[PDB]
């Protein structure tokens, strides 16, 4: 999809294998913000998006938190607390064509600004001078879009397919995880558990705390877990720390 | 916690249906006995130019669709009239059916995720509302309308609360923190009973009324054309 109408399909309820993406070499830029591209296989996200688009000409590096320009301010703006990865690679041999695939729009001018992670397909005529023009491209009223131009003659101006994976790992019970083979759970022993990304060490016991059908884990006064609803059985286990003390 | 709740002792608009604003969330409760209440409609303009949520409680299964519907002037659902000519929509959903029987509902749109809470109880008193669904719709909703004969509509507001979880993990009580001076004390001390004394809850501060700018009125335009658009650098 063109950058002014970037696609996005929310990925969930599946096993995410970021190994098949991290080791591939065709990707030109693989930059991750808030996460490391080598530790994506051991994490569990509540929802992972995939914003795919094509950005040729300049602004190949404007897809990043805290950047300005004609693309990052009028087409696709990322937040400042962005958590995810930004993958890019020039697709000159798929999105070029023998003549010109003038098929990608980029939305010049827009109005005054654009909020993060917002999209707008409205093609209403933009007026920079006087107001009178209503849906008519007049003297000082331009059609807002303006298409892209693709040809080898233009490296710093050839299309770069971009896929912006945006992970949100605090919004819900973790539904998309990495390729980690589950093991049997053992109770009454100090173990280093891993409940879909919830890493930690402790001794798991049976509990009497009657979880409600929607609650998935209990929490302490601090940001430490007290009880967990174990997957694959929906059982409520208590996490007590295995004994310690001075000597 | 600081979340969008219904402020205590707020004016709820008892209706007896026209479109209603869904500015940042909407409370909904109605006591019926034969399911005369039949669902909802959510959207921005409802003129097929944009997506719009729509819930209709079919006989046994609920229906949640986000399609560019064309709603009639008075859409109703026992004959349905609005659910026609829906084109290129991106969400469908089916689940268990919803609904002297007071049925409450809370509708919140948080970061494109449509959150629905509910509690059907047999309106003084208190009852915690457990969550039902979390719909990843990602659409803009500004108004809403119920699908039909007596329901209430309260609007949520970003006001922090002091939720009292019972020994069984259920919310038993709550303190509307910004309701009255006494309740703000209950957030400072983090308790539902405060002892005799004088507690400093917050700080009064007169807010500014006008923003005045006093720049020099020298109207000369700086020669940025003489340092950029020069002929010889």
């Amino acid at each position, epitope marked *: 999809a063109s950058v002014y109408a970037w696609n996005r399909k929310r990925i969930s309820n599946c096993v995410a294998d970021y190994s098949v993406l991290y080791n591939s070499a065709s990707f030109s830029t693989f930059k991750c913000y808030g996460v490391s591209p080598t530790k994506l296989n051991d994490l569990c996200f509540t929802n992972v998006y995939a914003d795919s688009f094509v950005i040729r000409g300049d602004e190949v590096r404007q897809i990043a938190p805290g950047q300005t320009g004609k693309i990052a301010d009028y087409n696709y703006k990322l937040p400042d607390d962005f958590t995810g990865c930004v993958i890019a690679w020039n697709s000159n041999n798929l999105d070029s064509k023998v003549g010109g695939n*003038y098929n990608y729009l980029y939305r*010049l001018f827009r109005k005054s600004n654009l909020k993060p992670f917002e999209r707008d397909i409205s093609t209403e005529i933009y007026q920079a001078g006087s107001t009178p023009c209503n849906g008519v491209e007049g003297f000082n009223c331009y059609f807002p879009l303006q*298409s892209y*131009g693709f040809q080898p003659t233009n490296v710093g101006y050839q299309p770069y397919r971009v896929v912006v994976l945006s992970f949100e790992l605090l919004h819900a019970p973790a539904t998309v995880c990495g390729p980690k083979k589950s093991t049997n759970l053992v109770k009454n022993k100090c173990v280093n558990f891993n409940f879909n990304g919830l890493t930690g060490t402790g001794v798991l016991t049976e509990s009497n705390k009657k979880f409600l059908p929607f609650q998935q884990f209990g929490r302490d006064i601090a940001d430490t877990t007290d009880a967990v609803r174990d997957p694959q059985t929906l059982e409520i286990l208590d996490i007590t720390p295995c004994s310690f003390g001075g000597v | 916690t600081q979340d969008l709740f219904l402020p205590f002792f707020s004016n709820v608009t008892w209706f007896h249906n026209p479109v209603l604003p869904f500015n940042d969330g909407v409370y909904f409760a109605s006591t019926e006995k034969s399911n005369i209440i039949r669902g909802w409609i959510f959207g921005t303009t409802l003129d097929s130019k944009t997506q719009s949520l729509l819930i209709v409680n079919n006989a046994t299964n609920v229906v949640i669709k986000v399609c560019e519907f064309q709603f009639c002037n008075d859409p109703f659902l026992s004959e349905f009239r609005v659910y026609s000519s829906a084109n290129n929509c991106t969400f469908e959903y089916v689940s268990q059916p919803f609904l002297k029987n007071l049925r409450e509902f809370v509708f919140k749109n948080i970061d494109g995720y449509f959150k629905i809470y509910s509690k059907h109880t047999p309106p003084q008193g208190f009852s915690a509302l457990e969550p039902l669904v979390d719909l990843p719709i990602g659409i803009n909703i500004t108004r809403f309308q119920t699908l039909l004969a007596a329901y209430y509509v309260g609007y949520l507001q970003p006001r922090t609360f002091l939720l009292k979880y019972n020994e069984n993990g259920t919310i038993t009580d709550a303190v509307d923190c910004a309701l009255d001076p006494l309740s703000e004390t209950k957030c400072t001390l983090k308790s539902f009973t405060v002892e005799k004394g004088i507690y400093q809850t917050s700080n009064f501060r007169v807010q500014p009324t006008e923003s005045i700018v006093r720049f020099p009125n020298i109207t000369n335009l700086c020669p940025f054309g003489e340092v*950029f658009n020069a002929t010889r650098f």
Partner: antibody
Amino acid sequence: VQLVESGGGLIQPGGSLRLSCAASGFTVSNNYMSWVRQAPGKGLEWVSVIYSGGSTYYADSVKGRFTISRDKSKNTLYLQMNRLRAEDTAVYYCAREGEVEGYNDFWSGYSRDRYYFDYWGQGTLVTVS
Amino acid sequence: ALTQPASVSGSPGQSITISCTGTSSDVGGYNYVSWYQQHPGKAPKLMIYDVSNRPSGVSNRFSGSKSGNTASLTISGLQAEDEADYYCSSYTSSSTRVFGTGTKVTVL
């Protein structure tokens, strides 16, 4: 930037003629496209202009008879001429307007206006008789 | 419309001015007056645009200006190649563009 034209030739009054202007190196939607004719051994008369999108603007001498169009897929500019007359005998040029930020005088930014004519087509003879 | 002198003449070395009078709608009101050069058998060439500016890649002797409803193309240092007709194209005043009658220059 290239602009090639075709479609002109001998034609009788009252008939129909459709002109073509294939544009390589740019699009019929990137910058304004305009048709301009020149009578044999005479001045230049602006025929019509289509903006980047949504404009069908013509001259009072060709209103209701000529319609300007384009094909984004083939990147060609078209000019229908219906009900031709003897005074339409001329060579027709398709002129691309000024691209946004022409020659980039680094003072003004991206305001499309830049109303002038960039490189032209080769021109095709239209003889109505 | 735009009126131009049907022809002007001069000797190499000196300067020549070229006038174009019009209404107050396009030339007198707006500021997008342009100038072109067309050799016999060739397509015209952008000589002046923005009615002050000159496109790069063009001899710097060319110069233009407009005083009210009248436009001016002040060519300086005529050479032998300058022999061609010059059309003054102002702005359009709501998308009905106009051109001058043409000034065929003849160099001595």
